[PDB]
Amino acid sequence: VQEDHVRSSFLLDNQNSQNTVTASAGIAFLNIVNFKVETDYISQTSLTKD
């Protein structure tokens, strides 16, 4: 009388988020013929769990 059990379990996760923020300027004809401002911002987050 022989027997056996197998019980595999496989649970995987992922949370791959992102951000991208940009600003701008460019007030330039009068009292200052030119000055320009722009910022950039990018953020990532990738978290896997198995």
Partner: protein, 50 residues
């Protein structure tokens, strides 16, 4: 930026960059085997021994 032809002609670029890349891998394997054998083949003393 900046310019003029009368009193105020300049230049500026205060460019900046901030990047921070962090990774964190974390792996954890665990194995655990247990296995046990048994045999018997019995023996009795005769009811009339001395």
């Amino acid at each position: 930026t900046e310019l003029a032809l009368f009193s105020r002609v300049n230049g500026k670029f205060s460019t900046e960059f901030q990047r921070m890349k962090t990774l964190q891998v974390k792996d954890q394997a665990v194995t655990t085997r247990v296995q046990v054998r048994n045999r018997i083949y019995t023996v009795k003393t005769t009811p009339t021994s001395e």
